[PDB]
């Protein structure tokens, strides 16, 4: 019996990009999950097939805290049946997904004078991504006869491309850190 | 929002015992690992032992394993650190710290001064 | 049990270089888990560092924190005056099992 270590997620120093988001697993711990729901912190709070109050109660195998930074007007795509650059290329959330989706303004940790470019997201994809699925590969697109060879080039894109986290951006624009909560029918509420 | 507040100054003799407070506010009492650490003067921090108000299982630094105990309070959130056979090495200015689990910080509190002397 | 031993014990520079505080653990700590401290005498211990690289509130950005594994770094870009002190790092976790370093001390060369 330990403590749910959330604080790594929420208060993380530096979040991943998008594109690859990270997956925090949690095993048997336990949780004041009634200090989440009531934090003006958040400006994101739904949960799915089950509700935020009554949330300190149920049990579980293991509980996933996946975290990443998006720009607030694709914080409408981290949800159940959504499309779009993030749902399709980034982070997808099952249909019949169980679970919340918190988010908040970030532009105050992940903004910089001049531009933070450090904060990446996919662009293009082969196919949509499934579920849960996280794509890393930088492999350069031959896209043309000519092979590039890891040199990019006329027919030859480079897969990612850098948000442009300006702190005068407008908030459709701004970075937004997520928090994506999924359950696995040991870790209760208290 | 969140705050500790220890108690006062003590001045004890060799031999006697001491019990130190630490009143948190916060909402975040329960769901913390509150530790105590004791600074002596000129000497560095030392980390003396910890409790999970939520578990109650106090765990003690070698040290500290038999002359200290660290308890706490859910009922009034007030965490506290009694020791006994009280040297003139006791001595030290004792911090009380506190983690939450939904957090990366450490909140403290302003410390005690106790003085084991005659 | 986990030791801190930081490197070095004292640290002699003057106003405007460059401090390089190093924390070494002799076990692999998760990076989530390390905290400086700055200590000026007669005061509490004033954190500066948490989370390894979080700046706590009000701590100036010549302050920054880095490092994994076993070492850890903080650093200070140009010195002020006011930045002497006695600065610690620390373990900690969700768990009740906290170690300390033994402290650098920081003084002006002058």
């Known amino acids: 019996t330990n403590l749910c270590p959330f604080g790594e997620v929420f208060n993380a120093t530096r979040f991943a990009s998008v594109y690859a988001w990270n997956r925090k697993r949690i095993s048997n711990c336990v949780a004041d999950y009634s200090v989440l729901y009531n934090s003006a912190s958040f400006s994101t709070f739904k949960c799915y097939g089950v509700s935020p109050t009554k949330l300190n109660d149920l049990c579980f195998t293991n509980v996933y805290a996946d975290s990443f930074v998006i720009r607030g007007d694709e914080v409408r795509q981290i949800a159940p049946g959504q499309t779009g650059k993030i749902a399709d290329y980034n982070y997808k959330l099952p249909d019949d997904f169980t679970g919340c989706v918190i988010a908040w303004n970030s532009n105050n940790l992940d903004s910089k004078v001049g531009g933070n470019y450090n904060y990446r997201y996919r662009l293009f994809r082969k196919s949509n991504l499934k579920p849960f699925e996280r794509d890393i590969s930088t492999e350069i697109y031959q896209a043309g006869s000519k092979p590039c060879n890891g040199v990019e080039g006329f027919n030859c894109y480079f897969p990612l491309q850098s948000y442009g986290f300006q702190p005068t951006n407008g908030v459709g624009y701004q970075p937004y850190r997520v928090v994506v909560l999924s359950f696995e029918l040991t870790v209760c509420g208290k | 929002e969140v705050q500790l507040v220890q108690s006062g100054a003590e001045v004890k003799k060799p031999g006697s015992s001491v019990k130190v407070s630490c009143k948190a506010s916060?909402?975040?009492?329960?769901?913390?690992?509150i530790s105590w650490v004791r600074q002596a003067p000129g000497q560095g921090l030392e980390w003396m032992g910890g409790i999970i108000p939520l578990f109650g299982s106090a765990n003690y630094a070698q040290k500290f394993q038999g002359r200290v105990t660290i308890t706490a309070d859910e009922s009034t959130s007030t965490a506290y650190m009694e020791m006994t056979s009280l040297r003139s090495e006791d001595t030290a200015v004792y911090y009380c710290?506190?983690?939450?689990?939904?957090?990366?910080?450490?909140?403290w509190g302003q410390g005690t001064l106790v003085t084991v002397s005659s | 049990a986990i030791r801190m031993t930081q490197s070095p014990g004292t640290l002699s520079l003057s106003p405007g270089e460059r401090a390089t505080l190093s924390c070494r653990a002799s076990?692999?700590?998760?990076?989530?888990?390390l905290a400086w401290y700055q200590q000026k005498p007669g005061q509490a211990p004033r954190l500066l560092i948490y989370?390894?690289?979080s700046r706590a509130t009000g701590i100036p950005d010549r302050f920054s924190g880095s490092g994994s594994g076993t070492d850890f770094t903080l650093t200070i870009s140009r010195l002020e005056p006011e930045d002497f002190a006695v600065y610690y790092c620390?373990?900690?976790?969700?768990?009740?099992?906290?170690?300390f370093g033994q402290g650098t001390k920081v003084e002006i060369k002058r």
């Open positions: 076990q692999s700590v998760s990076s989530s888990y």
């Open positions: 989370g390894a690289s």
């Open positions: 710290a506190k983690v939450s689990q939904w957090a990366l910080i450490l909140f």
């Open positions: 916060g909402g975040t009492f329960s769901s913390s690992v």
């Open positions: 620390q373990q900690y976790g969700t768990s009740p099992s906290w170690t």
